Design a protein around this ligand. Structure first.
Ligand SMILES: Cc1nnc(SCC2=C(C(=O)O)N3C(=O)[C@@H](NC(=O)Cn4cnnn4)[C@H]3SC2)s1
Length: 490
C-alpha cells in the first residue's frame, strides 16, 4: 500500500479510471428493475370475435364494473377462453413484453419468470466472473462483461419470442453481476487503504442515482424495445473505453507476475506526474515491499463458531434482498404514476443511507439491522392489510419500508465484515452477497402467489424481515469493538 503512495496516492489515475469504472453502475439499477417498465401490465381485457357485427355484449364485468381480463362471452348477451387474444390499452404503455407475446391471465406468471431468470444469471455471474477475474484479471473480465451486456441486452431488445428474451436476460444479468463485482475490486485495489470505504459508498449512491435515470429514460421511451436497447447500448461505449484501463498491480503480485506490478505502478506514476518516485522504484523494491503479502467456504460449515455467524447472517442478507425486490418489482397498484414512485423510491434511499449511518454509530450496529428490518417487515405487512382505495397510505408505508431495506443493505455490508474474522471475512461476505441474490431469484417466484391470494406475496415479504429481525439478536454487538483476526476472538 505504501508503494501506491509512492507512485502517488489517490492520483489522477485514481480520479480518471475510478469515474469510468463506476459509470456503468448507473445502468445496473435500470437493468435489474427494468421490467417494471419493459414488462409493465397495461389494462387488458379480451378481444371479441370479428364475426360480431362494442364490448358491452361480449365481455363479462367484475365487481368494479370493468371488462374482465380472462374471459369473454360465448354468445351475444356462458363465458369462454379468449381465442383471438386481448385488447390492451395504448395509453401509458404502447408496447411491453406482456402486450408483445401475451403474458396475461394463464400466462400471468411468465412475466415474473423472466425476472427470476435474469436473477439466476446474476447469481451465476458472481461465481463465474469471480473465478475468471482471479485467473485472467479484473480488467480483462470487465472488458468481456461490457461487451456481453451490450450484445445480449441488444439481442433481448430484438428477441423474436419470449424464450430467446429470457436467455438473453440471463446472459445480461450474468455480465452485470461480473460488473458489480469487479468494479469495486478494480476500484479498491488501486486506491489507498483509508479511502476504501469511500469507494464502496460512492458505488452504493451511484446505484441509487440510477433509479432517477431509469424513470426519465422509460418516460422518454416507453416502448419496451427502444427502452431495453437504450439501457444496453451505452455498454458498447464502456467496452471501448475499458481497453485503456490499467490492470490491478495487486493481482499481478499475487498471481505472480511481479514484473507487471512494476509497469502497472510506473504508468500510474506517469499519469499522477510523480514519475521520479516510480523511477526510483525497481524490482528490488517490490521483492521486499510485498514480500509478506505475496508470501474456504467449507470452513464456515465446519466450524460451529463460524456456522453460527453464517446461518444467522445468511438470513439477514436473504430477507433484506427478498423483501426489497418484493416491494420494488410492483410499482403498479400504488395508485399513482409508475414513474413518479421510481423517483420517490430512489429519493428515499438517500436520506435512508444517512439516518441508517446515524443509528449505526449512535445506537450501534446490531440495533440497526433489527430496527431497519422490523420496520421494513411491519410496513410491508400493512400494505397487504390496508385497502387499495387508500393509495397515499400504501405509497407512504411502501416508501418507508423500501428506505428501511436500503438502510438494511448498508448495515449488513458493514456488520457482516465486523462479525467474521480476517481469515474468512472476504469469503463469508461473498457468501452473504450470494444469499442476497438467492433472495432476488425467490422474490418473483413469491409474486406468482398473487394468483392464489392477491395479498399473499405482501404477507410473505412482510413476515420474512420480521423473522430476520429476531435473528440479529442471536449475533453479538460490534460497536466500538476491534476487528477479529481468529475464530477464538470474541
Ligand atoms: C449493485 C451493487 N452491488 N454491490 C453493491 S455494494 C453497495 C450496497 C448497496 C447500496 O445501496 O448501498 N446495495 C444495493 O443496491 C443492494 N444490493 C442489490 O441491489 C443487489 N446486490 C446484492 N449484493 N450485491 N448487489 C445493496 S448491496 C450494498 S451495490
Amino acid at each position: 500500500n505504501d508503494l501506491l503512495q509512492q507512485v502517488g496516492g489517490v492520483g489522477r489515475f485514481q480520479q480518471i479510471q475510478v469515474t469510468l469504472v463506476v459509470l456503468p453502475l448507473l445502468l445496473m439499477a435500470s437493468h435489474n428493475t427494468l421490467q417494471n417498465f419493459t414488462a409493465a401490465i397495461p389494462t387488458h381485457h379480451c378481444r371479441p370475435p370479428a364475426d360480431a357485427n362494442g364490448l358491452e355484449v361480449w365481455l363479462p364485468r367484475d365487481r368494479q364494473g370493468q371488462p374482465e381480463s380472462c374471459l369473454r362471452f360465448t354468445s351475444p348477451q356462458a363465458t369462454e377462453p379468449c381465442t383471438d387474444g386481448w385488447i390492451y390499452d395504448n395509453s401509458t404503455f404502447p408496447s411491453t413484453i406482456v402486450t408483445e407475446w401475451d403474458l396475461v391471465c394463464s400466462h400471468r406468471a411468465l412475466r415474473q419468470l423472466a425476472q427470476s431468470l435474469y436473477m439466476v444469471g446474476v447469481l451465476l455471474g458472481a461465481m463465474v466472473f469471480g473465478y475468471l477475474a482471479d485467473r485472467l484479471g479484473r480488467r480483462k473480465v470487465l472488458i468481456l462483461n461490457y461487451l456481453q451486456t451490450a450484445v445480449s441486452g441488444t439481442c433481448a431488445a430484438f428477441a423474436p419470442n419470449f424464450p430467446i428474451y429470457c436467455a438473453f436476460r440471463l446472459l445480461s444479468g450474468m455480465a452485470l453481476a461480473g460488473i458489480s463485482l469487479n468494479c469495486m475490486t478494480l476500484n479498491v485495489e488501486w486506491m489507498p487503504i483509508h479511502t476504501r470505504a469511500c469507494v464502496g459508498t460512492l458505488i452504493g449512491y451511484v446505484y441509487s442515482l440510477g433509479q432517477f435515470l431509469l424513470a426519465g429514460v422509460a418516460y422518454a421511451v416507453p416502448h419496451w424495445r427502444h427502452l431495453q436497447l437504450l439501457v444496453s447500448a451505452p455498454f458498447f461505449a464502456f467496452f471501448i473505453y475499458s481497453w485503456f484501463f490499467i490492470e490491478s498491480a495487486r493481482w499481478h503480485s499475487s498471481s505472480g507476475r511481479l514484473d507487471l506490478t512494476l509497469r502497472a505502478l510506473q504508468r500510474v506514476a506517469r499519469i499522477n506526474g510523480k514519475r521520479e518516485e516510480g523511477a526510483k522504484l525497481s524490482m528490488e523494491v517490490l521483492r521486499a515491499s510485498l514480500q509478506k503479502e505475496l508470501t474456504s467456504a467449507m470452513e464456515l460449515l465446519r466450524c460451529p463458531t463460524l456456522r453460527h455467524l453464517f446461518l444467522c447472517l445468511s438470513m439477514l442478507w436473504f430477507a433484506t434482498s427478498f423483501a426489497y425486490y418484493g416491494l420494488v418489482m410492483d410499482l403498479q397498484g400504488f395508485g399513482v404514476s409508475i414513474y413518479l414512485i421510481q423517483v420517490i423510491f430512489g429519493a428515499v434511499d438517500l436520506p435512508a443511507k444517512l439516518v441508517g449511518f446515524l443509528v449505526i454509530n449512535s445506537l450501534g450496529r446490531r440495533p440497526a439491522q433489527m430496527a431497519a428490518l422490523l420496520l421494513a417487515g411491519i410496513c410491508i405487512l400493512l400494505n397487504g392489510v390496508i385497502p387499495q382505495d387508500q393509495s397515499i397510505v400504501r405509497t407512504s408505508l411502501a416508501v418507508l419500508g423500501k428506505g428501511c431495506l436500503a438502510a438494511s443493505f448498508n448495515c449488513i455490508f458493514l456488520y457482516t465484515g465486523e462479525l467474521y474474522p480476517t481469515m474468512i471475512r472476504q469469503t463469508g461476505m461473498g457468501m452473504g452477497s450470494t444469499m442476497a441474490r438467492v433472495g432476488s431469484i425467490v422474490s418473483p417466484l413469491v409474486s406468482m402467489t398473487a394468483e392464489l391470494y392477491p395479498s399473499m406475496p405482501l404477507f410473505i415479504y412482510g413476515a420474512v424481515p420480521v423473522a430476520a429481525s429476531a435473528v440479529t439478536v442471536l449475533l453479538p454487538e460490534t460497536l466500538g469493538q476491534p476487528l477479529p483476526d481468529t475464530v477464538q476472538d470474541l
